[PDB]
Amino acid sequence: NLPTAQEVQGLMARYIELVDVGDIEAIVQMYADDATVENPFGQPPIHGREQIAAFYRQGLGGGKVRASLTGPVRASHNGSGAMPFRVEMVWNGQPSALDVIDVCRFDEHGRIQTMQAYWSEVNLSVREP
Amino acid sequence: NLPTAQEVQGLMARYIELVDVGDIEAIVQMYADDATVENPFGQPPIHGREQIAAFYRQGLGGGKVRASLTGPVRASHNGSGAMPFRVEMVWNGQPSALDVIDVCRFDEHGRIQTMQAYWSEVNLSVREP
Ligand SMILES: C[C@]12CCc3c(ccc4cc(O)ccc34)[C@@H]1CCC2=O
Numbered sequence: 001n002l003p004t005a006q007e008v009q010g011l012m013a014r015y016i017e018l019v020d021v022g023d024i025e026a027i028v029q030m031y032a033d034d035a036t037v038e039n040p041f042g043q044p045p046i047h048g049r050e051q052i053a054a055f056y057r058q059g060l061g062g063g064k065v066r067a068s069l070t071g072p073v074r075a076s077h078n079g080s081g082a083m084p085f086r087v088e089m090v091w092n093g094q095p096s097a098l099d100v101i102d103v104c105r106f107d108e109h110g111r112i113q114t115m116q117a118y119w120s121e122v123n124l125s126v127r128e129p
Numbered sequence: 130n131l132p133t134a135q136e137v138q139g140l141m142a143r144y145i146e147l148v149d150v151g152d153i154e155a156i157v158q159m160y161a162d163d164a165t166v167e168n169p170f171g172q173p174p175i176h177g178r179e180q181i182a183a184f185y186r187q188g189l190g191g192g193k194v195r196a197s198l199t200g201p202v203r204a205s206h207n208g209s210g211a212m213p214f215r216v217e218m219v220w221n222g223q224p225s226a227l228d229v230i231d232v233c234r235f236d237e238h239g240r241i242q243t244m245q246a247y248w249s250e251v252n253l254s255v256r257e258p
């Protein structure tokens with residue numbers, strides 16, 4: 001049924017692992033085929049597995065991206081959760097890091113219905129040699 | 130006008146300080162007089178400054194409660210932002226720490242229009258004696 005609070009922590013953490021290894025196939029599978037992503041939040045949503053698969057295609061492709069949690073998945077009892085992680089990637093030629101908080105609502109099947117990634121330039125940090 | 134990504138970080142960080150010292154008056158003032166709180170997210174919203182002030186009245190009163198950021202406020206360009214923080218208080222007689230993430234939308238006046246505190250028992254750590 002609707003993911004318990006503990007199941008949300010497990011799903012949202014596994015998602016980070018799939019993003020980490022750039023497993024787009026697996027990432028997309030975690031999404032409902034009509035899910036909506038807003039990354040960055042503030043930007044128009046993208047709906048559907050196809051468009052979403054293209055989003056991660058271009059985002060995890062092209063360059064080197066690692067991601068991992070930096071704190072506990074805060075999970076609720078209505079199939080939702082927010083998590084702190086850090087994205088490592090090459091920005092403006094430089095190896096940079098991006099602090100992000102993802103909020104995720106799942107459905108009665110465990111799949112992500114709604115994805116919202118909170119970040120902007122104030123969360124971007126370029127790293128010295 | 131609508132708070133900038135940087136204004137958001139400052140606003141949301143000030144909030145935590147207000148909660149921390151339990152300044153209910155100043156906390157309520159950060160709220161639009163028709164703001165809606167959802168703490169814990171999943172629970173029915175509470176509308177209006179009067180119901181919100183009551184919520185913090187009982188939430189911050191009666192017991193001891195500290196709260197401080199445990200990471201950077203992730204802030205977007207639409208007056209929104211999410212923050213990671215920790216809540217210290219007495220739960221079930223025992224001193225406990227609670228991991229929470231607040232999502233907040235601000236209006237064109239810099240006041241909180243929507244509050245959403247993601248957390249549950251899975252984020253509750255009772256401090257061993
Ligand atoms: C998209 C991105 C790579 C991966 C990524 C970013 C931001 C938020 C994310 C949120 C996710 O849940 C998964 C991946 C990202 C980076 C911002 C700029 C960029 O290169």
Ligand SMILES: C[C@]12CCc3c(ccc4cc(O)ccc34)[C@@H]1CCC2=O
Pocket residue numbers: 148168188189194216218227229231246248
């Ligand atoms: C409500 C509470 C005190 C304050 C508080 C809690 C949880 C989340 C919060 C989120 C906030 O943005 C502000 C205050 C709280 C505690 C959970 C149990 C408790 O008594």
